[PDB]
């Protein structure tokens, strides 16, 4: 299945565009599930968002390994 990651990312998208605003993603990442570190968050959103706009694409992160 591909819903192993993608279907779990939608559950955060409140825009339905395909890209969430880093700020929101950061607050949920170190809140829901387990507890990571500010380091493991910022760096995670850094390796993904290369543009710097703020709207990071989640499927671009999911289909990354496939790329």
């Amino acid at each position: 299945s591909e819903e192993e990651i993608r279907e779990a990312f939608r559950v955060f998208d409140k825009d339905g565009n395909g890209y969430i605003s880093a700020a929101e993603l950061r607050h949920v990442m170190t809140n829901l599930g387990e507890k990571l570190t500010d380091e493991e968050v910022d760096e995670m959103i850094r390796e993904a968002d290369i543009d710097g706009d703020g709207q990071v694409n989640y499927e671009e992160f999911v289909q990354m390994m496939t790329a």
């Binding site: 779990a8 829901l32 493991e40 390796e47 390994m65």
Partner: peptide, 25 residues
Amino acid sequence: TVGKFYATFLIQEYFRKFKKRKEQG
């Protein structure tokens, strides 16, 4: 840049463990 695949893996198992954990406790 250094380990994007590693980061990808992080969320991979993160969502996986959470999805099945939510139905466990």
